[PDB]
Amino acid sequence: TEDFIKKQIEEFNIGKRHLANMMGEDPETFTQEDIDRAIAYLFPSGLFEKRARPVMKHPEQIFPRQRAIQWGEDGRPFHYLFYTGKQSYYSLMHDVYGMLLNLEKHQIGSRWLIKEELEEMLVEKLSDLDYMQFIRLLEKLLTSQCGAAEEEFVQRFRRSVKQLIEPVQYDEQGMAFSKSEGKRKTAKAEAIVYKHGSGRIKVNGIDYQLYFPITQDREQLMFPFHFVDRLGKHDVTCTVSGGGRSAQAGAIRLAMAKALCSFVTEDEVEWMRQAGLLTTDPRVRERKKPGQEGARRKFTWKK
Amino acid sequence: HYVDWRMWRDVKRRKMAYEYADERLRINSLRKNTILPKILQDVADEEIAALPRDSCPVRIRNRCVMTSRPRGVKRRWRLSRIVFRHLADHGQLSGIQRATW
Amino acid sequence: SRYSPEFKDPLIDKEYYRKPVEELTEEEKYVRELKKTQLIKAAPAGKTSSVFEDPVISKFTNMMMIGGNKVLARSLMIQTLEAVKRKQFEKYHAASAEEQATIERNPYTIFHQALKNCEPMIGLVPIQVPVPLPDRRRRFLAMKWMITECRDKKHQRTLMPEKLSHKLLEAFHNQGPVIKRKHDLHKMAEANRALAHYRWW
Amino acid sequence: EFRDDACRKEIQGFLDCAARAQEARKMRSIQETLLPNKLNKLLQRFPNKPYLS
RNA sequence: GGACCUGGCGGUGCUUCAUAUCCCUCUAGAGGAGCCUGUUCUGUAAUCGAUAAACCCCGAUCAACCUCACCACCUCUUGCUCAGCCUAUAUACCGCCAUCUUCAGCAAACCCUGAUGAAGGCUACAAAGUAAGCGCAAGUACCCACGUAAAGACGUUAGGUCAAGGUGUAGCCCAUGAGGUGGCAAGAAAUGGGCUACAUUUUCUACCCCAGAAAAACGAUAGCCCUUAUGAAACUUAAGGGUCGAAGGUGGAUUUAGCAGUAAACUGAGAGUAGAGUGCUUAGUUGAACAGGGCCCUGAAGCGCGUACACACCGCCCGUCACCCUCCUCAGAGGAGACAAGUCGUAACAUGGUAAGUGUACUGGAAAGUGCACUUGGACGAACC
Ligand SMILES: [K+]
Ligand SMILES: [Mg+2]
Ligand SMILES: [Mg+2]
Ligand SMILES: [Mg+2]
Ligand SMILES: [Mg+2]
Ligand SMILES: [Mg+2]
Ligand SMILES: [Mg+2]
Ligand SMILES: [Mg+2]
Ligand SMILES: [Mg+2]
Ligand SMILES: [Mg+2]
Ligand SMILES: [Mg+2]
Ligand SMILES: [Mg+2]
Ligand SMILES: [Mg+2]
Ligand SMILES: [Mg+2]
Ligand SMILES: [Mg+2]
Ligand SMILES: [Mg+2]
Ligand SMILES: [Mg+2]
Ligand SMILES: [Mg+2]
Ligand SMILES: [Mg+2]
Ligand SMILES: [Mg+2]
Ligand SMILES: [Mg+2]
Ligand SMILES: [Mg+2]
Ligand SMILES: [Mg+2]
Ligand SMILES: [Mg+2]
């Protein structure tokens, strides 16, 4: 109700001034971010669910959009579609149908607002079928080769929806290099790829052929350079820790590929991404669950 | 007014063990070494046997302090699993929370 | 799977990316444009762009693997290939000039041809009924038959590289218990021919 | 004697026929999707009226 | 007794599904050996509880004494307690949970339909449903927005726990209470789970992955002896060492788990103990194969159909054979009804597993079977397919 909301708004302004005074800041320039930071400092709450933590937002945000009365003192509703029970939605559909009728008589990065957004706009509950009907009508409107007024009206309902390259640096001698990091399983690696070299890769100061006796891991190291046709065209120094041999090999591969992106062309970078050299493998160990042998191996069902 | 006769017996055992710990430690020091004469060690053995039965530390059982449960007692809190679950679930134990990972 | 369904499997083929734009069709151009907006699964640690990557041999190694001992499986596979090549070289040298033309020496070709010869054409399924076998099932049956025959206890103290090389050469020449097993499957299918109508597909 | 040497042709025909059967299965499955669902939707708009309004 | 409603059930119809799940398909196991351990049976003077899924390395993240509630003997009586009881009742309960649930439904309060009956409330090119709330969802922890956790309402199985503790009821009160000493705990026999193996993708050594030897040995964590750790107490527990080199040679039906960093294999840590698990929780490494057909087999959903069931098919129920009564006809015996349990079958109720029944005839332990005709008091799924 208006009286309650006005009292809340005035109380919130007064409390905002008190909070600014308590934090020793200008009451006038005190902003919502300042209010939030001050409240967080004054009432520290580690509850994970942010909505649970203390909050002193404006009453407009705090309280829901409780709808106003629809009929006056005489009992006569205001909207002629009132008795439809969904006056806002049906009036919107009526307007869309009228626009389509007018169009017929005279003759990319944006999605459609979800049913939740439409409900928020219409302050009315909706069914998926009603929302689908409305969206189909909007699609017909847009396809009808409408005018600018209709397009801007539709914009009320429309909703707008590559790898990043590390910067090249220069060593003491000024020779160029790039740096990157990657992780795989528990392994973490950081790679420095120089612009010129004989393909020599030193992991933890040890040459790769000695650090990775396994030809599989050596192939994993080879994979990026072979992909971009640069076998022997660079030297690399990598530092890795954690995980096993294969995890370390994968992490070093990822770090080296990310660093090499600093040198290879953008087409080569995109091709590497499409080949999967620049995606951190999210696959990690799955925790054992109580009452079962492993992540998924249940105990032998007894009979 | 302890929870039960078993808890009362354990309390008696703890009191007796605390009373006789120093004497037990002294007499057992002689036995648990290979320096003193074997005859002295044997007389020490018979003496430590002669000490009252309840003084033996091995007879102290870690029962829950609130319900006298003889098993499933978490040492850090001295509470049976049931009572610990009750209090933790009601949120009356600092820090402890339902684990999810 | 930790990957969301949006993630797409990686395509590891240098030629596919080096292909000129002009040779691309409109469908291919659209696919390449779309892939620039899709997420790509991290390339598995198994397959790479090495020209010496043989997916058939990689799958055979995976099948031979026991308890995640990929290193030992790879060692056995490479030992088998080396033994096959060495036997071929010995036969080549011991053979006359004419037979040297016939004597193959490429272990990869020998392996592929042996598995192809061991692939069964018609299978049996409970419905038992003779039925066609899809190509994937044919290849898997060939590989599994080869590995099981090599693992048979009948061979005493003989190492897996030698056993598998001998069986592979026998299969390449259309002999051995693996080909006998394929013939047995074919014979059982022929015997149950009359029941082919029981199949509803 | 169940030897592929001469059977090559018949075996190839068998494989081709199996591939054709699978392709026809796929084509029929995709082509199948007036269907009962659409027909019943049409009928519901004009229900039979065995009673009086 | 006739007709309906709801639900359960159907060896019930059609359709669509099961994504580690119903079958085939893939991987690794169990079922064959030894050992560890739980349960049952035996034994003893010697617990108790769980005990189909949803019991069986379960209460116990733990028994030499204690723990212990069991047994034998002994001792005390206002007793640690303004007593006590591990005495019966989980079919009185709280408390915490299994279970479908790997579900998305439960819904108060209204309104309407059925002539104002039990009951029902569905059609989006919409035809009486609206629903606060709970759940799902959303949100949250872990490493994403993924996945795994967590969560998972109302109800079912009077599911488990009176032995976590409390409590109603009933019960002992010189004992069914309290204390002490000592004691079981083994295996005729079976059975579940786990571990170790049966080896050559193996074994020993070095290293921790470019080696050398073994190879009829492989194979015990088993047995016996000794030592050590803890402990007042060790054949009892554990570790080590010695000694022994056993069974067995990938295992029938059948059966378990798994959709990816998963299975499989391997290595740690922790809880709890003075000590103690091949057990539990948890961290990490290497790291697979199939993933496609289907609905002849099991369950799920939707629409249906039938129903003599409603403690809801583990239901209901028919007839004979034997057993006590009451009545009727009968030279003594039969019939009926009732009471009532067994017995053999499963005839009927679902397509009741051969649809049911009428008449009639033959046959048969017994419901009954079949023959010929007749009824629907059965269906044939209701466009073409
Ligand atoms: K077995
Ligand atoms: Mg103890
Ligand atoms: Mg399964
Ligand atoms: Mg066994
Ligand atoms: Mg028992
Ligand atoms: Mg019992
Ligand atoms: Mg005793
Ligand atoms: Mg005892
Ligand atoms: Mg008692
Ligand atoms: Mg109960
Ligand atoms: Mg449960
Ligand atoms: Mg869970
Ligand atoms: Mg949720
Ligand atoms: Mg009960
Ligand atoms: Mg019980
Ligand atoms: Mg007594
Ligand atoms: Mg031994
Ligand atoms: Mg000692
Ligand atoms: Mg030996
Ligand atoms: Mg019957
Ligand atoms: Mg019948
Ligand atoms: Mg008849
Ligand atoms: Mg007859
Ligand atoms: Mg007639």
Q: How would you describe what is shown here?
A:
This is part of a larger assembly, with chains A (303 residues), B (101 residues), C (201 residues) and D (53 residues). Chain A is an alpha+beta fold. Chain A contains eleven helices and eight strands. A six-stranded mixed beta sheet of chain A has the order 3-4-5-8-6-7. Chain A has a two-stranded antiparallel ribbon with strand order 1-2. The termini of chain A are far apart. Chain B is mainly alpha-helical and 101 residues long. Chain B has one domain. Chain B is built from three helices and two strands. Chain B has a two-stranded antiparallel ribbon. With 201 residues, chain C is mostly helical. Chain C has a two-stranded antiparallel sheet. The longest helix of chain C has 25 residues, at 70-94. The two termini of chain C are 33 Å apart. Chain D has 53 residues and is mainly α. The longest helix of chain D is centred in the N-terminal third of the chain and has 28 residues, at 4-31. Chain D is rod-shaped and about 80 Å long. The termini of chain D are far apart. The complex binds potassium ion and magnesium ion (23 copies). Chain B binds one RNA strand of 385 nucleotides through residues 1-6, 8-13, 24, 27-28, 31, 45, 48-51, 53-64, 66-75, 80-83, 85-86, 97-101. The PDB classes it as ribosome. The entry lists the keywords mitochondrial ribosomal small subunit, translation-initiation intermediate, immature h44, single-particle cryo-EM, ribosome.
Looking at how many chains there are and whether they match, the oligomeric state comes to part of a larger assembly
Q: Helix-strand pattern of chain A, N to C?
A: HHHHEHHHEEEEEEHHEHH
Strand order of the largest sheet of chain C: 1-2
Beta-strand segment tally of chain A: 8
Helical coverage of chain C, percent range: 55-70%
- Work out the radius of gyration of chain A: 31 Å
Q: Largest interface, counted with CB-CB under 8 A?
A: A-C, 28 and 21 residues
Morphology call of chain A: elongated
Order of helices and strands of chain C: HHHHHHEEHHH
Which secondary-structure class do the elements of chain C indicate? Answer: mainly alpha
What helical percentage do the residues of chain A reach? Answer: 40-55%
By DSSP (H or I, 4+ residues per run), the number of helices of chain A equals: 11
Per DSSP, the total helix count of chain C is 9
Number of strands of chain C: 2
Short account of what is shown:
This is part of a larger assembly, with chains A (303 residues), B (101 residues), C (201 residues) and D (53 residues). Chain A is of the alpha+beta class.
What's the structural blueprint in terms of helices and strands?
The structure is cut from a larger assembly and holds chains A (303 residues), B (101 residues), C (201 residues) and D (53 residues).
Chain A: H1 2-22, H2 32-42, H3 59-62, H4 87-106, E1 110-112, H5 115-122, H6 128-143, H7 148-155, E2 158-160, E3 169-170, E4 176-184, E5 187-194, E6 201-203, E7 206-207, H8 208-211, H9 215-227, E8 236-241, H10 245-260, H11 266-275
Helix pairs in contact in A: 4-6, 9-10
Chain C: H1 14-18, H2 26-35, H3 55-64, H4 70-94, H5 97-102, H6 107-118, E1 122-125, E2 129-132, H7 135-151, H8 160-172, H9 177-191
Antiparallel strand pairs in C: 1-2
Helix pairs in contact in C: 3-4, 4-6, 4-8, 6-8, 7-8
Chain D: H1 4-31, H2 36-44
The structure holds potassium ion (K) and magnesium ion (23 copies).
Chain B binds one RNA strand of 385 nucleotides through α1, α2, β1 and α3.
Region (Disordered) (chain A): 282-303
Keywords (chain A): Acetylation, Mitochondrion, Ribonucleoprotein, Ribosomal protein, Transit peptide
GO molecular function (chain A): RNA binding; structural constituent of ribosome
